[PDB]
């Protein structure tokens, strides 16, 4: 019965910055991992940026060092700070929660699109 919800996508210049917002109707300490993944239509969905609720974060090899993801307990929402983009960013980011208490949830996404103009 859980609910994710993605915000803060939309257009950026190359090497700009957005983050993202995933705000969760449970208390987030009660998901076991929360994970971004993204994926471009046409191409396989790809895990971006993963958070347990110990606080490990791991991070794909292509985001390491730009992408930051982040509990924020207070406002019940995890972000991903997402710096540097390029076009190899563009896609629609996923928010996924894992409850091991075994199941999945995810959200509707948000779409990125990295274009210079």
């Known amino acids: 019965q859980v609910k994710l919800q993605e915000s803060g996508g939309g257009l950026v210049q190359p090497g700009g910055s957005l983050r993202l917002s995933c705000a969760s109707s449970?208390?987030?300490?009660?998901?076991?991992?929360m994970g971004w993944y993204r994926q471009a239509p046409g191409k396989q969905r790809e895990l971006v940026a993963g958070?347990?609720?110990?606080?490990?974060?791991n991070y794909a090899d292509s985001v390491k060092g730009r992408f930051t993801i982040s509990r924020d307990d207070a406002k019940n929402t995890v972000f991903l700070q997402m710096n540097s983009l390029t076009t190899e960013d563009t896609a629609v980011y996923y928010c996924?929660?894992?409850?091991?208490?075994?199941?999945?949830?995810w959200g509707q996404g948000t779409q990125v699109t990295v274009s210079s103009g």
């Open positions: 449970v208390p987030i300490f009660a998901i076991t991992v």
């Open positions: 958070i347990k609720r110990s606080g490990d974060t």
């Open positions: 996924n929660a894992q409850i091991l208490s075994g199941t999945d949830y």
